[model samples]
Target: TVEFTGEQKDALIEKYWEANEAERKAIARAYASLFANDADFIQRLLAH
Candidate 1:
């Protein structure tokens, strides 16, 4: 699995907030795929 830097995560979060509903869904799916095998990553994402 690829590792995301803190800045990258923050950037993604910024994009998520700026996205419309459909875009947000797409982002969610992309992140899900990106972190599919990383449960801890998903938990951290949720906490953020």
Candidate 2:
């Protein structure tokens, strides 16, 4: 299981917001790999 602090999450979200479309997809794919077991997180990431 992976855990992230609120600040860390904020940083991740900020990075996503700052990215272009392709970069966002790449980042989301990487996050999906990192949190593969967390379906809800994957779904949320894919939903964006």
- The model with the greatest TM-score is 1
- Candidate 2 worst ten-residue window by lDDT: 39-48
| lDDT (tens digit, per residue) of candidate 1 on 1-48 | 798877777677777768899898999988888877767666666666
Off by over 4 Å in 1: 37-48
* Candidate 2 residue-wise lDDT, 16-45, digit = tens: 768999898898778766767755654454
Estimate candidate 1's alpha-carbon lDDT, on a 0 to 1 scale: 0.77
Model 2: residue 34 alpha-carbon error in angstroms: 2.5
Candidate 2, residue 5: lDDT? 59
- State the local distance difference test value for candidate 2: 0.68
**lDDT for 41 (candidate 2):** 59
lDDT of each: 0.77, 0.68
